[model samples]
Target: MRSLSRFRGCLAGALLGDCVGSFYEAHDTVDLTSVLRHVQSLEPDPEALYYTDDTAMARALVQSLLAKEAFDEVDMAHRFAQEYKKDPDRGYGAGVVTVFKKLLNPKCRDVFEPARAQFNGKGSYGNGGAMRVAGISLAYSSVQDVQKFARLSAQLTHASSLGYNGAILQALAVHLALQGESSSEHFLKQLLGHMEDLEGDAQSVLDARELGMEERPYSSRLKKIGELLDQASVTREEVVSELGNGIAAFESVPTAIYCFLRCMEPDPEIPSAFNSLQRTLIYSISLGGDTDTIATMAGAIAGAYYGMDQVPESWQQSCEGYEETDILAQSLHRVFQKS
Candidate 1:
């Protein structure tokens, strides 16, 4: 049931989210009317609505996958380092820049060393891994394959259990969304089931005291998302307070999923004319912190569920790298089918 339209929607949506969501990254609040007007009046101006490190790293991920025809951790690490070197002005984090610098060493045999050395050897639990992981879902066939490769792909830069687990959560969201008929009920059910298994396994890793303690973090968030979905009027502040809107993978990834799920039904907060995809983006961007990464993650799920035709053509044209993203999506879909 996987189609090229959903594939294009996934990457294109992530690109669009990164591009548009960058506008309100640090803002405390956004005027919905003004934001909607600005988006509606947008034209194809790459200078105004260019992507950030999110799309740049994601493009490198797609390039590595297409070239290797499979997961290659070393190549992915190299591509990430090379991409950062090619354009260091893409808003990469300070810690990641250090890792990229260490990756430049030719004798760096242990690809995971640089990441493990981060945060005083505990490694990063940031959202960087989850931000660029949409491609992994499209290239794999089964859910197990998606889980395996998603972990391997994320551990390249994010060695912490929270970091890579968030990547697995994001990839699993996209994978289930792409499988067709992802009604809110079925969607959350599958996610909770999978997360239970992942968190149970991660308990062993966390017991070694590599990082702080948070038992079944993602599952707990999904449970809150379930509760929030039942409410008729949930404010942005409430969502941000409960789910968080920060750079941490635990904070942002669940916030993104909540955005997509909460906006599944029509809302008075968003304009009536806006479709599900538009509502998802607007809601994500409205959260106001780490907007690009959250929207990009939410966009991947919304785009997969709604397909390319649901995305606004004007929005697509307004964003940079749309065509290239489209091409990559199709290629990933082909690889998926062949597998």
Candidate 2:
């Protein structure tokens, strides 16, 4: 039952985050209010509210997870590449699209090739893989299983170890959140416990650390995660401040983590997960960058805890694949129910 509950929670959170943030993919949070006002949804015209490359990439991730069940790196890469090829308008980054085009060459199955790499081994911090990671967490309740899916899903397109690790971090964030044991503090401490010990993977480690409270609004509950980023030599303000609102993994994941922390500690006795999910989406949309991905992560975490019933009818009705979310959630539940 615990596993089943978590499955619904994680799945709902993922889709909620994606749909809510779809309205403001790359907007900067300069004048927070102005930014929000100018957003398509807020505008008098009522723009399309379409999702971008972030959600597209995530959809592929979830589809791959549902079909594959286990992490087979080669298969994962192929699936990502295939889906990417099917939709040129999926909002793929130049670097990523270039990599996909190159993959068409028979010689380029090696995703690690020089030209295919992001920032020439600087690695992509894009939220591409993090967007759809809830599927893995839902399928594999254990951190260990989610970790593997995270790595392999990332390698399909990202190919960089740092990139793989970033997805892993996000996946674990959702997985832990589903168990209802993770707050911002537990999320950070657990992440640091695993990542700090590693020598390399600096980008992923830094991304996780930036997720602390100092980077976010002052909150009393759950002991904000960003504070440690300030306490360490990292200069939390600078590090946290630089985190993006773009489609980059660096921008989305930390923001997602932050949103989760913000919505956590609900009004006492009001176990209403919808209320928590709403605020989480608001926080993600308000923070700006990579809105869909941030909302996606927060949604996945909150949804995992609350299940489908907590999600709003209008929001669900608005999603492109909303009707399938419940079916997918229940289908994935069977994969982990026995474990």
Best by lDDT: 1
User: Which window of ten consecutive residues has the lowest lDDT sum in model 2?
Assistant: 213-222
TM-score, per-candidate, Cα-based = 0.94, 0.76
Off by over 4 Å in 2: 30-49, 111-116, 181-183, 199-248, 265-274
Please give me the total number of clashing residue pairs in predicted model 1.
0
Candidate 1 has a TM-score of 0.94
Candidate 1 Cα deviation (angstroms), residue 319: 0.9
Shift in Å, residue 250, candidate 1:
0.7
**How do the residues 135-200 of candidate 1 rate in per-residue lDDT, one tens digit apiece?**
999888689999998888888888787888899999999998887676787888899999877888
What is the Å distance of residue 150 in model 1 from its true position?
A: 0.9
Model 2 residue 311 CA deviation in Å: 1.3
Model 1 C-alpha RMSD to native = 2.3
lDDT of 2 by residue, 115-226 (tens): 3355654555455666666677776767777777676666666654445555776777777766675555666777655544431455444534454423212121113346
